[PDB]
Design a protein around this ligand. Sequence first.
Ligand code: O1O
Ligand code: O1O
Ligand code: CO
Ligand code: CO
Lengths: 381, 381
Amino acid sequence: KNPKSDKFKVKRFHHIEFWCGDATNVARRFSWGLGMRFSAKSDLSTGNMVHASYLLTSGDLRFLFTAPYSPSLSAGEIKPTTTASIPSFDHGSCRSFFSSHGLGVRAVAIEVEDAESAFSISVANGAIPSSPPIVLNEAVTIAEVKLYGDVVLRYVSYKAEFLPGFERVEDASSFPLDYGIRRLDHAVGNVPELGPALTYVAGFTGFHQFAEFESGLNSAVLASNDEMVLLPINEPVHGTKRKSQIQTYLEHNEGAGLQHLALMSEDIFRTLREMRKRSSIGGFDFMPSPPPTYYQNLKKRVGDVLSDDQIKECEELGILVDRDDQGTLLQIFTKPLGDRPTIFIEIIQRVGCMMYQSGGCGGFGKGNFSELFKSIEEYEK
Amino acid sequence: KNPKSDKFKVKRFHHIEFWCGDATNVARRFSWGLGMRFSAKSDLSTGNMVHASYLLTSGDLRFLFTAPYSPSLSAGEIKPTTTASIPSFDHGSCRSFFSSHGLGVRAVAIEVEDAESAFSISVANGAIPSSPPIVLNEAVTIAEVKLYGDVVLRYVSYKAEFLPGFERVEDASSFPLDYGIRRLDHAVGNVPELGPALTYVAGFTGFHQFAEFESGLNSAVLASNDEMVLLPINEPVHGTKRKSQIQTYLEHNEGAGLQHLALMSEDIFRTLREMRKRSSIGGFDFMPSPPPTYYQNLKKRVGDVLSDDQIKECEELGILVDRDDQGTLLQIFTKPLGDRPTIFIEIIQRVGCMMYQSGGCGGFGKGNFSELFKSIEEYEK
Ligand SMILES: Cc1c(C(=O)C2=C(O)CCCC2=O)ccc(S(C)(=O)=O)c1-n1c(=O)cc(C(F)(F)F)n(C)c1=O
Ligand SMILES: Cc1c(C(=O)C2=C(O)CCCC2=O)ccc(S(C)(=O)=O)c1-n1c(=O)cc(C(F)(F)F)n(C)c1=O
Ligand SMILES: [Co+2]
Ligand SMILES: [Co+2]
C-alpha cells in the first residue's frame, strides 16, 4: 500500500556529497574506481576561497567531494560576501565531521519543486533545521535539515549547470569514463534506534513505509510518492552470537550515519567486470564471493529469470540475486570505501516491474541474509 | 668542497610519510598515479586500533600514508600498552597537522647507523626533539626531531620488514605496478627565512652546503657526507612583479613545510609516458609544457648528451633539461598533489658523474628558471 503522503513535491535523488580532508584525492580515486567523469568544479581556480568541491557524474548519478581550505584564505569574508559556492558549508562543521566520522556522506540531496517550501513544511513538521533556504544567482534554491547523525537531507530546486559558481570541467581534464552506472537507487542510514529515526523522518517528509517481501539488524524503508526516493534505515540487534555489523558501524563512525549507497547499473555484468579489473590498481574491492553452493541453488530460485549462462556470469563476478513477488534484484557490495569499516557501496540492477520500471523492484536483498548462511553451511559439507 | 662533517653516520633516505585524513584513498590514488605497489600495512586488520598506515614501494622509494582512527577505539590504551605501530603517532597532532596544512609530508625519514645516537647528538647540537628514541620489538629504533614547520626528520636504525607490527600485503591486493621510479633523490622545504633554517638544520646534522652550478626564491642545499641525502630549502623573494610561489605556498600551507619530493626514475621517458597516460583517469597532472623554442634551444645546450631523437622525446613528454659542470639533469614537475597549491612531485633522471653515480649529478635545475623565461619570450615572437 502507498498512501502518497509526501508533504511536498519530491522529484528524484539529485546528488550525494562526501565531506573529505582532501577532495582531489578522493575524487580521483572514486572516478577511476567507479567510472565516473569529472564534470564540474568549484575551487580556487573558480574564485572559491572557502572550499574545494569536485563533481563526478555517471549518467544521472552525481557524487560531490568537498574539503575545506585554510580559513585564513577567507578570513575577511562574511556570509553576505562569501566566495563559497555552497553557502551551507562551514569550515568548523566540516573539520568536525571528518575528524569525528572519517570520510563519509554529509548530504543526501533530493531535487524538489520548491526548496523553500520543502524546508518550511519540513521544519513545521518536526525537522531539525540545518541550513535555511538560500537562493543562488536567482536560479537555484538550497536548504538542509538534519536526517540522522551529522547527515543532512538537502533540498535543491531549480527555477528553470550543477550549481551557480560551479564551472564545467575542460574536456582535457574530463576523460569520458563509464562502467555503466546510471543513478542512485537508494541511500541507507545506520542508527542506534530504528523506531525514533523513522518517526522523525517520516514525520517531516510524509514519506511512507515501503512494503518488504537474527542477522544483526532490523530495517525499514521510507519512500516518496512514486517510490523513486528510497531511504532505508537500519538499527542493530544486540545479544547475538556474531556481533552486529550495524553496531560495529556505530562504534567506528562515532554514531549514526550513512551506511551504503546503492548505485543502479544499466548492465551490472559490465560494471562489475570493469570495477573488478581495477580493484588492485586504485579502485574498489568487493566483499568475498558466496560459495558455489549459492549459485548451484540459484537455478531453483531464479531459473525462470536468468539463463544458465547468465547465472554462471553471476558466479564469475560474485553477484548476488534476490527476488520479491514483483521483480528480481542483482546486487553486490564493496568493501568499505575508506579507512574505517563504515560506508560501502552497493551495485544493483533490477529486472521486472515494467509499466518505465517502478521503484524498488525486487526489494533490497533481505532474502540474501539467510540464503548466504544456507549456502556457506551447504558448501561446508 | 665537501668537508664530510656529518655528526652521525647517515645512510640513505628511508621513507616519506604523508599525514592524511583517509589513508586508503590517498594511497590508492598515489599507487595508480605513480606506479607504486602496496607492500605493507598496519591497521585494524593487524591489531592497530590507533592509526591506519599503508606503505607503497617502487624500487627503493617508500611512501607511507597514515590517518587516525576514532580515538575511542584506543581510549583504554596508554603508551606502555599502545597498539600503534608508529609510537610517535598522536591523534591530536595528526588532526591538527591535517587541518592546518592539508595533505602533506609529516616525516622525512633517513636510515642511520644508530637512531638513539643520532637523536642524542642532534638534540645536543640544537635539534628540537619531537619524539624520543623508541626500540620496536628489539629490532628497529625510531626517533624524531623537528625539521621545519610541522615536518620532522625521522631517524630509523636497524639491528639486522618495514617496521615491526607492519604486515606484508597479500599478492592479491598487491598488483605489481611499476613505471620506473626507483628512489627519492631529494626532499625540499619552503620556509619564511632561509638563513635561520639552514643554520638550524646544518647545526644539528653536520650536513654541509652542496655547491650550486629574480625568479621569486633563494635556495640552498644541505647534504650528507656522500651527498646521497639531499635537503634543499627555499625562501621567498618579496617585492617582485610576479608574486613568489614560495610565498603562495607559505600562505596556503599555513607556514613552512615540504614543497616537493624529487623521485629518481631509471627511465624518465617510460615513467612520463606511463604517468601521462593516467593523468585524467585518477593519476597526476603535469605542469604546462615549455614552448617548442625551449626544445629548439636544447640542441645548443645538451646536443652532446642527447640525440635529436632523445631531445624530440623530451619535447613529446614536456621534460626539462639542465646541466652543471659534471652532469645533466632531466626533470619534470607535477601539478599539486592535493587540493592546495602546496606540495608537488618532481620526476628526475641524472646522467653523468660515474665513478655508481655521485649524488646531485647535474644539480637541481636552477638554470631552467631563466631558460624557460627565455623560451617563452622567444616563442612569443
Ligand atoms: C546491506 C545489505 C543489504 C542491503 O542493501 C539492505 C538494504 O539496502 C535495506 C534493507 C536492509 C539491508 O541490509 C542486503 C543484503 C546484505 S547481505 C549480508 O546479504 O549480503 C547486506 N549487507 C549487510 O547486511 C551487511 C554487510 C556487512 F559487511 F556490513 F556486514 N554487507 C556487506 C552487506 O552487504
Ligand atoms: C622547484 C623547481 C626546481 C627544483 O627542483 C628546485 C630544487 O630541487 C632545489 C633548488 C631550488 C629549486 O627550485 C627547479 C626548477 C623549477 S622551474 C620554475 O624551472 O620549472 C622549479 N619550480 C619552481 O621553482 C616553481 C614551481 C611553481 F609552480 F611552484 F612555481 N614549479 C612547478 C617548479 O617546478
Ligand atoms: Co541496499
Ligand atoms: Co627539485
